[PDB]
Amino acid sequence: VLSEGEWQLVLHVWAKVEADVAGHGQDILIRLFKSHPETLEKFDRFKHLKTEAEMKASEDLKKQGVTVLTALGAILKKKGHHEAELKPLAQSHATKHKIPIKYLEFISEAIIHVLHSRHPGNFGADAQGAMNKALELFRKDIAAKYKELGYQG
Numbered sequence: 001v002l003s004e005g006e007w008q009l010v011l012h013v014w015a016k017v018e019a020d021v022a023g024h025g026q027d028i029l030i031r032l033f034k035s036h037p038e039t040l041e042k043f044d045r046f047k048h049l050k051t052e053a054e055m056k057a058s059e060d061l062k063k064q065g066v067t068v069l070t071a072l073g074a075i076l077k078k079k080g081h082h083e084a085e086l087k088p089l090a091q092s093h094a095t096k097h098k099i100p101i102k103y104l105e106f107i108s109e110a111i112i113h114v115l116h117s118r119h120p121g122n123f124g125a126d127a128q129g130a131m132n133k134a135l136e137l138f139r140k141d142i143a144a145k146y147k148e149l150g151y152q153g
């Protein structure tokens with residue numbers, strides 16, 4: 001369970017993401033695909049992209065980055081009270097997209113990497129620890145839902 005002070009560190013860096021969620025989403029997805037290229041294979045819409053340049057020019061990838069980060073932002077703003085938000089997300093990602101917990105760890109690592117690079121003014125050590133806690137809680141609750149849904153993540 002996160003403290004309110006930890007939630008505020010999470011929400012204060014998310015406020016900067018929201019200055020330009022599209023640009024942050026491009027950076028985060030591209031970082032994920034460069035660090036863990038196997039994850040790109042899950043996105044049938046744009047798994048054909050070969051280079052970071054193609055990735056940056058992809059309108060579909062940009063829209064996906066907005067979709068991801070906006071859904072995650074809604075979850076974070078619930079400050080752990082995210083049962084309703086996790087239901088459809090767990091179901092689609094367990095059953096339709098088939099995203100292992102290991103890949104949610106990968107995208108969490110990409111989010112932390114991009115925030116560390118872009119936002120040193122709001123992502124010092126304490127803030128990064130709070131974000132890690134929030135993302136661990138997200139993955140913990142998602143993994144429990146995966147099991148309820150019949151998916152070993």
Ligand code: HEM
Nearest residue numbers: 039042043044045067068071072089092097099103104107
């Ligand atoms: C913070 C973690 C994540 C969040 C909040 C998130 C959120 C979403 C949302 C809102 C959608 C659209 C609605 C839906 O299908 O449920 C979506 C679609 C999708 N997600 Fe995720 N996602 C996350 C992580 C991942 C990861 C790590 C992968 C793959 C490695 C992935 C693969 C996909 C795919 C393939 C789609 C369908 C894209 C398409 O329409 O072609 N997701 N995600």
